[PDB]
C-alpha cells in the first residue's frame, strides 16, 4: 500500500495472508468469507506467462495477522488448503477479466477478536454503495512504493497497512488506460487534482476492497485488488475485480460444496 497508514489491531479481521511454503514468501492478500472459505484473485495462483500455477499443497493461508513477518504466536492461525477454485473464464491472456478464485480450507477456522469474516454484497448493497466518489478501503502487506520498476524510501511494511480510496467514474477509468476494461471490474483512487493520494501495490493483490454500510453498519467486500499500472501514479488508477458481478459463480461453488 502506497501512502497509507498502519492498521489498528483487529481493524481488518477478515484479512488473510497468502503464504508460500517454499521458499517461504508472501504471495498475496486474500479475504475470509466464512469459516472455511477464502476469496482471492485468480492471478495469485494462476499466471501462465510467468509459469505461475500454484496448487493446494503449494500454499499456506495465514489468518489473524498484523505483523508481516513474524509468527504471531497465539494470535494468528495457519491453514492448509483443501481445494483451489479459479473462475472458468478468468482471462489471463489479455486483461485479467474475472480475476477471482475461491479457496476452501482444510479445516474451519475459529473466530476470535482477530479473525472474523467479511460480508459479500447483495444486489441492493452493491447498488447503493458502489458509486463514484464513495470511498472504500484497501488493506495489505505489500510494497510501500512502486515496484517492477522497483523502489526506495521504505519498501516493505512492518505491519498491515490501510488506505481509503474514492471510487472513480467508469469513463475516467477507461481513459486512463489502453487495456480493455470490462464490466467485471471497477477502478479506484484519487484524481491528480485532489491532493490526497494513495494506492495498492505489489503483494497487495488478492486482498479486500471493503466498504462499511451506513444502513446496517456492516462491512462488505466490494472488490478484490487486481491490477494497476505502476502504483500511485498520477492519472493512473487501481483496478478491482467486481465482486457482486461474479457472485453467481461464488454461490455456485460454495452451495455445491457445502
Amino acid at each position: 500500500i502506497v501512502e497509507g497508514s498502519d492498521a489498528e489491531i483487529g481493524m481488518s479481521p477478515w484479512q488473510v495472508m497468502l503464504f508460500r511454503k517454499s521458499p517461504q514468501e508472501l504471495l498475496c492478500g486474500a479475504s475470509l468469507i466464512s469459516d472455511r472459505w477464502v476469496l482471492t484473485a485468480a492471478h495469485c495462483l494462476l499466471y501462465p506467462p510467468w509459469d505461475k500455477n500454484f496448487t493446494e499443497n503449494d500454499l499456506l493461508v495465514r489468518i489473524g495477522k498484523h505483523s508481516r513477518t513474524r509468527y504471531e504466536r497465539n494470535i494468528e492461525k495457519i491453514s492448509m488448503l483443501e481445494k483451489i477454485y479459479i473462475h472458468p473464464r478468468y482471462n489471463w491472456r489479455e486483461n485479467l477479466d474475472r480475476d477471482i478464485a475461491l479457496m476452501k480450507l482444510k479445516k474451519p477456522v475459529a473466530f476470535s477478536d482477530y479473525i472474523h469474516p467479511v460480508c459479500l454484497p447483495d444486489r441492493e448493497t452493491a447498488a447503493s454503495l458502489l458509486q463514484a466518489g464513495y470511498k472504500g478501503r484497501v488493506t495489505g502487506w505489500g510494497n510501500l512504493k512502486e515496484t517492477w520498476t522497483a523502489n526506495v524510501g521504505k519498501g516493505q511494511p512492518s505491519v498491515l497497512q490501510v488506505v481509503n480510496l474514492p471510487i472513480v467514474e467508469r469513463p475516467v477509468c477507461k481513459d486512463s488506460t489502453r487495456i480493455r476494461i470490462t464490466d467485471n471490474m471497477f477502478c479506484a483512487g484519487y484524481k491528480p487534482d485532489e491532493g490526497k493520494r494513495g494506492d495498492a501495490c505489489e503483494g497487495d493483490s488478492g486482498g479486500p476492497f471493503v466498504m462499511k454500510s451506513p444502513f446496517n453498519n456492516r462491512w462488505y467486500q466490494m472488490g478484490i485488488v487486481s491490477w494497476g499500472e505502476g502504483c500511485d501514479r498520477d492519472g493512473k488508477y487501481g483496478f478491482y475485480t467486481h465482486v457482486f458481478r461474479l457472485k453467481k459463480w461464488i454461490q455456485k461453488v460454495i452451495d455445491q460444496f457445502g
Binding site: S5, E8, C119, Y134, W219
Partner: peptide, 27 residues
C-alpha cells in the same frame, strides 16, 4: 449472520481511526 461486525469495533461500539472518512463520503 455476524459477518462484517468486528469484535473490537462494531461489537463494542468503538470506531476505528478513519472510518468516518468512508461514512462521510456516502453523501
Amino acid at each position: 449472520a455476524d459477518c462484517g461486525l468486528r469484535p473490537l469495533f462494531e461489537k463494542k461500539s468503538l470506531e476505528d481511526k478513519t472510518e468516518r472518512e468512508l461514512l462521510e463520503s456516502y453523501i
